[PDB]
Amino acid sequence: GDRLGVLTTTRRVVEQAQAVWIDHDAVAQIAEAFAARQVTPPTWNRELHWSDGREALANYILVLDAVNFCFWGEPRWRIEYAGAVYDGYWALAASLKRALEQGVPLTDASYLAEITRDDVATIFAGEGEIPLLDERARILRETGSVLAERFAGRFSDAIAAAGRSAVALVDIVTNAFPSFRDVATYRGEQVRFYKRAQILVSDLYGAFDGSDLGAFDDLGELTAFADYKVPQVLHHLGILRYAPALHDRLARREEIPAGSPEEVEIRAATIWGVEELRRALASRGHALDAYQVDWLLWDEGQRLPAGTLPYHRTRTIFYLEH
């Protein structure tokens, strides 16, 4: 009963993967250590996430996760907000919070549909520039116009139609919002990931404390989010191993083309690294959903020692949405 096909399609990749493999001995050791001290993932962060009424909050979560990709590049994109400097995901979250607090209607489908390059450039203004600035402007325009066209400008209408099924909501989102379609091929077979769509559903659960629009009966059916920080943490913990050419490529910070065998192997092995860690923890009496193991690992990613292998650098592509 794998209704999105993420676990099934990524499993075919892991079985034939040339450049990446899971160290199942490292999985058992990490599980033993994590189970011994009952590791919980950080609660959904209240400080850097915007909050308001249920209609605006639901739309805020859709917007946040629509543009939640690819924050790396030199010079480093950094954001000043409320007396602190942010980079990566937190720069994204802080930027949207800053904008909404200064009265920028980023929860209004009518504003989103029309948002210009200069609007998003201002919202994301700081040191350097957010990567793929134009891409994020196009995605936000797509997001607004699908909200206005299909959901009466309310993402709450899409959530109500899911009937408290996380899996049904991911499917509703990828069906209606083309930029959420996150699939690839490996040796001629489709591989399904749905990173941003699964983050979105888990973010609703967090933001709404598992109630109202954040109520879901099947959160265990979500997989890990095949991003670039979680594989970096899994490599650091010895769970993911990289073959010679891929290891050197990451060490030199050489970019890996989206949808290339190396990238799809990292992503597939991310999903199964987390799933194998989930199973090993459960076996030792520490039961977490795969998305919770992902949150836990993502949190470790924000304080990795100096000298850990760098995260893989893949520019997200939306060629089919141009």
225 is in an annotated binding site: yes
The verdict on residue 1 lying in a domain is no
Q: How was this structure determined?
A: X-ray
C-alpha 183/C-alpha 178 separation (Å) is 11
Q: Cβ(224)–Cβ(291) under 8 Å?
A: yes
Number of domains observed in the structure of the chain:
1
Cite the beta strand spans of 172-275 per DSSP E.
183-186, 189-192, 240-242
Helix/strand/coil percentages in the chain, nearest 5: 55, 5, 35
Cα distances from 180 to residues 57, 67, 108, in angstroms, run 19, 9, 19
Tell me the catalytic residues: 227
| Domain span at 211 | 6-321
C-alpha 68/C-alpha 173 separation (Å) is 15
Map residue 314 onto helix, strand or coil: coil
Can you give the length of the chain in residues?
Answer: 322
The verdict on residue 106 lying in a domain is yes
302 is in an annotated binding site: yes
157 is in an annotated binding site: no
118 is in an annotated binding site: no
Q: Cβ(60)–Cβ(112) under 8 Å?
A: no
The two beta strands, 240-242 and 183-186, are unpaired
